[PDB]
Amino acid sequence: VVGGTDADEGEWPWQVSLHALGQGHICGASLISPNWLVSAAHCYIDDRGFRYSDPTQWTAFLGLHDQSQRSAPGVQERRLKRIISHPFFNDFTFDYDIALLELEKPAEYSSMVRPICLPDASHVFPAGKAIWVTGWGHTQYGGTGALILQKGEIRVIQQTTCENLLPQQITPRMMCVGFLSGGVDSCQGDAGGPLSSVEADGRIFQAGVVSWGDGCAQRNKPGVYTRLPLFRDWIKENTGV
Amino acid sequence: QTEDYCLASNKVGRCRGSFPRWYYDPTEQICKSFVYGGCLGNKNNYLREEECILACRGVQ
Ligand SMILES: N[C@@H](CCC(=O)N[C@@H](CS)C(=O)NCC(=O)O)C(=O)O
Numbered sequence A: 001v002v003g004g005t006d007a008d009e010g011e012w013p014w015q016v017s018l019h020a021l022g023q024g025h026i027c028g029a030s031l032i033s034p035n036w037l038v039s040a041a042h043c044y045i046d047d048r049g050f051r052y053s054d055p056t057q058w059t060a061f062l063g064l065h066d067q068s069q070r071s072a073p074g075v076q077e078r079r080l081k082r083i084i085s086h087p088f089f090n091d092f093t094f095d096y097d098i099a100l101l102e103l104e105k106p107a108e109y110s111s112m113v114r115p116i117c118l119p120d121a122s123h124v125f126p127a128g129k130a131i132w133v134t135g136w137g138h139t140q141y142g143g144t145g146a147l148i149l150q151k152g153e154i155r156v157i158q159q160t161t162c163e164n165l166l167p168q169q170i171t172p173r174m175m176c177v178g179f180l181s182g183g184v185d186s187c188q189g190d191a192g193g194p195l196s197s198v199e200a201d202g203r204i205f206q207a208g209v210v211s212w213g214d215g216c217a218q219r220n221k222p223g224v225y226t227r228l229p230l231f232r233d234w235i236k237e238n239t240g241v
Numbered sequence B: 001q002t003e004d005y006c007l008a009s010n011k012v013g014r015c016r017g018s019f020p021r022w023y024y025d026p027t028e029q030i031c032k033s034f035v036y037g038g039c040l041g042n043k044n045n046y047l048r049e050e051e052c053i054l055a056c057r058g059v060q
Helices: A159-165 A230-238 B001-006 B049-056
Strands: A015-020 A024-031 A034-038 A058-062 A076-085 A099-103 A130-135 A151-155 A174-178 A196-197 A204-212 A221-229 B019-025 B030-034
Touching: A024 A196, A024 A204, A024 B019, A034 A151, A034 A204, A058 A099, A099 A230, A159 A174, A221 A230, A221 B049, B001 B019, B001 B049, B019 B049, B030 B049
Parallel strands: none
Antiparallel strands: A015 A024, A015 A058, A024 A034, A034 A099, A058 A076, A076 A099, A130 A151, A130 A196, A151 A174, A174 A221, A196 A204, A204 A221, B019 B030
């Protein structure tokens, strides 16, 4: 996350860290129930002689605050049993960039670990709304990760604007969030992490999934995120959530 | 071919994963670490330092 600040401890109890064997933190994810995580499809594709689609190759850390303290109280470590990449995912266009991850054993809800709410399929996150991106990703493009979980407040951008800023690259599955001014954005290491949105009763709903961007935090180059409401029924049908 | 595998600049790309990878730098004649986004990378992109060294040994 570029231009963010340290999250408070326990502030984002749905934020998850995914580690691949011998490689440390690769992607974020969100907890949506005791058994299921939402993440990005592009994190879990076979490559360079390593099977990123193979669930045995991953470890999920829940209730994590600091990457150098993964044995702190309340941190829960979990293996994956299943990875479901969306069937329509396209690794050239990044369309349908979403995945469901099944924990080998359920998460235990605590002050540190809790699920995010899922929006109904009909819900719209309105243009201009201040929402939050979180992660341990880079603080600058081509830079370095953050030990302490970062948060950054960003704003929903009109789809028409989004399309014109990134011509021929934005599908209806995608949403621009950030600032036309740049300065605050997600970055490498943040993919698969949730957009968090405070709703009418103060509860937090997932607005989308960190996906891609043209560098990070550049002017007129906001982050591009996978929409959540559109995939509500797909999630229900595959997970029962 | 050594052109692509060893002489090309490293490519982070647009995707926002953080995949620790290795690339050969022909100006230093050494393999160095970089972070790959996960999509549409080029061939100068190795999972292990040892594999990068093997692929690009001696290349100028
Ligand atoms: N119903 C849950 C407790 C409520 C809960 O943790 N719901 C989540 C998902 S709907 C939530 O409100 N998270 C967002 C937030 O706390 O702001 C239970 O009894 O286990």
